[PDB]
Amino acid sequence: HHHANIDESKIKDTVDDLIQPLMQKNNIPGMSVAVTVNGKNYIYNYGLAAKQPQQPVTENTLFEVGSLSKTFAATLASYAQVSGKLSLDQSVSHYVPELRGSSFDHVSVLNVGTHTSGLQLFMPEDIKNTTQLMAYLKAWKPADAAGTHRVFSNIGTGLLGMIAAKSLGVSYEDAIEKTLLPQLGMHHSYLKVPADQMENYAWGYNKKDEPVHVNMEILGNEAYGIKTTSSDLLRYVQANMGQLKLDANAKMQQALTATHTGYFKSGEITQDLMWEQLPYPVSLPNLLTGNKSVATPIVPPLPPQENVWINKTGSTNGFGAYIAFVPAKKMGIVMLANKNYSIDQRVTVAYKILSSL
Numbered sequence: 355h356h357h358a359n360i361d362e363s364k365i366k367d368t369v370d371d372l373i374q375p376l377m378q379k380n381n382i383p384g385m386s387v388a389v390t391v392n393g394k395n396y397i398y399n400y401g402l403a404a405k406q407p408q409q410p411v412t413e414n415t416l417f418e419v420g421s422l423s424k425t426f427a428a429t430l431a432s433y434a435q436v437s438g439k440l441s442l443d444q445s446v447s448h449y450v451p452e453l454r455g456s457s458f459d460h461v462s463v464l465n466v467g468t469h470t471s472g473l474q475l476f477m478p479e480d481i482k483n484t485t486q487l488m489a490y491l492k493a494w495k496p497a498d499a500a501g502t503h504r505v506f507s508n509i510g511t512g513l514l515g516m517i518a519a520k521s522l523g524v525s526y527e528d529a530i531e532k533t534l535l536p537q538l539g540m541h542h543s544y545l546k547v548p549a550d551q552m553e554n555y556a557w558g559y560n561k562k563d564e565p566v567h568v569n570m571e572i573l574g575n576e577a578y579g580i581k582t583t584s585s586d587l588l589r590y591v592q593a594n595m596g597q598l599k600l601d602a603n604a605k606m607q608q609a610l611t612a613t614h615t616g617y618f619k620s621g622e623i624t625q626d627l628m629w630e631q632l633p634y635p636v637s638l639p640n641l642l643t644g645n646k647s648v649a650t651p652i653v654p655p656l657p658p659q660e661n662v663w664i665n666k667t668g669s670t671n672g673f674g675a676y677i678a679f680v681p682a683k684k685m686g687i688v689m690l691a692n693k694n695y696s697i698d699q700r701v702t703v704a705y706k707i708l709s710s711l
């Protein structure tokens with residue numbers, strides 16, 4: 355029930371007024387929006403996780419988050435770094451000996467953590483196993499030297515997560531589901547959704563409005579494997595702002611914070627470890643203009659800041675996700691949808707909601 359002067363109702367009015375038209379105009383079946391401010395959390399669910407038979411979005415609905423998954427690979431690499439197992443400045447072939455003598459002698463772990471190796475966006479469809487992947491990587495050359503340009507890459511994020519996990523002595527899937535997500539308290543976050551949660555796994559709806567789930571291919575866990583709830587992602591946002599006890603895991607807090615280090619500038623955007631940031635306050639135009647480019651190194655790296663807007667978009671064929679948070683304001687938003695709608699609208703709605711707080 356609505357109550358004037360009560361936090362949850364004031365925020366709900368703002369969120370409803372933006373999300374209901376957004377869902378109508380884009381024919382988005384279902385969304386969940388989670389907001390944190392002043393140490394308090396608010397979760398709003400809209401519409402349908404599935405159309406036939408109908409299932410509503412609930413607190414337990416799982417959405418695919420696409421390239422938001424890359425921030426977990428970065429957090430894992432950062433955890434390995436702060437634990438003394440990984441140096442970001444070292445070469446990929448230092449950690450992957452089969453690539454020694456290849457172009458990966460000249461690509462750093464930082465490059466694959468910042469989209470500056472030059473590897474292309476999509477894994478080639480005919481690469482099915484590790485032998486084929488290594489043969490491809492050993493024979494690969496970019497047109498420009500590593501460190502010169504920013505090219506968003508699922509392959510690069512794959513290498514980042516693989517190297518981080520190996521440096522901890524485990525597979526990536528183990529590192530994420532047995533180490534990282536449990537230490538973050540994200541108990542409804544998965545690379546593979548278990549049987550008791552399938553009833554909660556929303557269907558995605560593609561451009562033709564067909565129900566779809568993402569197909570997991572080689573190195574896909576690193577780049578697009580996460581399925582999660584808005585509540586778990588809001589915990590992740592709070593952890594990224596140092597707000598949670600985190601079971602006294604000092605190394606994990608340091609790992610999260612260190613992913614916000616600013617390593618390259620492209621246009622107006624600062625590239626962190628997978629996260630992207632802009633100075634705060636942000637104007638909507640610069641946010642929108644932010645969504646190969648020349649990459650200029652920031653050296654020494656920009657330390658993790660408070661006065662910034664940190665964000666990440668992610669999509670799959672059937673889903674569209676967005677996170678933004680402002681550490682100086684201890685505020686953040688997670689928007690999950692089971693339809694891939696345009697990034698300009700994600701950032702505009704998030705900006706309007708956070709501005710209202």
Ligand SMILES: *C(=O)[C@H]([C@@H](C)O)[C@H]1CC(SCCNC=N)=C(C(=O)O)N1
Pocket residue numbers: 420421422424506507508577578630665666667668669670
């Ligand atoms: C991620 O959503 C897909 C991946 C699952 O194939 C692609 C498309 C995007 S493009 C850059 C988004 N800009 C700012 N946040 C990426 C990605 O790395 O974000 N990979």
